[PDB]
Amino acid sequence: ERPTFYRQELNKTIWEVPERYQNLSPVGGSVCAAFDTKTGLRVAVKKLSRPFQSIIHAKRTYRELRLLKHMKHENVIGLLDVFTPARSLEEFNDVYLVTHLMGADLNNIVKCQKLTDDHVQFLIYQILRGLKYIHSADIIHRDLKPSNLAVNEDCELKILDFGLARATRWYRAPEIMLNWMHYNQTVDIWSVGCIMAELLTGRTLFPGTDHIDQLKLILRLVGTPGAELLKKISSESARNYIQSLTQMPKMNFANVFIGANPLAVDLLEKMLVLDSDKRITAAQALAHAYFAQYHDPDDEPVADPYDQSFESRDLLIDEWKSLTYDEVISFVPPP
């Protein structure tokens, strides 16, 4: 039951989509907002860029589709449709992904108002709830930032672009930015702390100009690593570099986030720590007293087992293309 497709050029690529999707308008692969005539809702349509023109692209294409088909959670963007104008595998060269269109991203929100404490609580609670789910599937975001957190008029939130990375500087955990010690899923928690601070104050917590300046701003708040944490620094170059910097004492966060809910400050103290072994997890964060009004252990679900064995495979473009085609054809839209 192939739908009828129509073709158009939108500065300056070809978009070939089902007539179902009307009034495409660029918003960003490349992304367009559109009207889904079947449902009456606005959607975001992403055309993957050159999905099968290289092995890296082919594998990324498969990776993204597999992730989107598996993750089903209220705070994680969901796949509404996936299509190709191709009539067969032999003709398969383009892939389009469709999701709900949201109202605004967190960058837009902070630029336009001032958020009350309850508003912050609910947003952060939702981000952590989505992260608990994603992390439970052994997936991490790795590049969580205000631009990939989308909300709709009722403050209902969705996480986008997770599990793809394998401004960012402002929200990046130092252990990955500086490759200075082992890391775990809490790299995403550092990002949440930076985001939460920004929602609370209205300003970027650590707006560094480059990686060196970024570290400088971070250490001004958290304090230079000393003997204790230095014991865990595996990189000799990193140890040498750290010891070359002007030593800074840790700041009491309460003197920084003046006027903030003391519980918000306590939570930030637990997220913004350099030691990856000590940083709070998503699940632990949800249980923090700051979220007492929202927390419900019976409504913070985990993900069904996720098979990502494909990550360890080295296949040809046509092989990844065939696997992707299989997933496109087998797709069943959300009820």
Ligand SMILES: CONC(=O)c1ccc(C)c(Nc2ncnn3cc(C(=O)N[C@@H](C)c4ccccc4)c(C)c23)c1
């Ligand atoms: C696992 O990674 N794959 C993904 O997450 C993944 C995969 C496919 C897709 C189609 C998406 N969705 C989006 N991708 C890129 N930009 N974009 C922006 C919005 C949006 O709603 N903007 C609002 C504020 C807006 C509202 C009005 C106008 C303009 C913008 C959405 C929903 C997206 C994510």
Ligand SMILES: CONC(=O)c1ccc(C)c(Nc2ncnn3cc(C(=O)N[C@@H](C)c4ccccc4)c(C)c23)c1
């Ligand atoms: C990846 O491709 N490059 C390669 O070939 C390759 C291969 C092996 C290694 C060990 C690396 N090194 C890095 N890889 C990824 N991130 N990273 C971040 C930093 C950094 O900021 N160091 C700080 C402490 C610093 C700052 C100033 C001076 C000294 C150290 C470094 C040195 C890296 C790269």
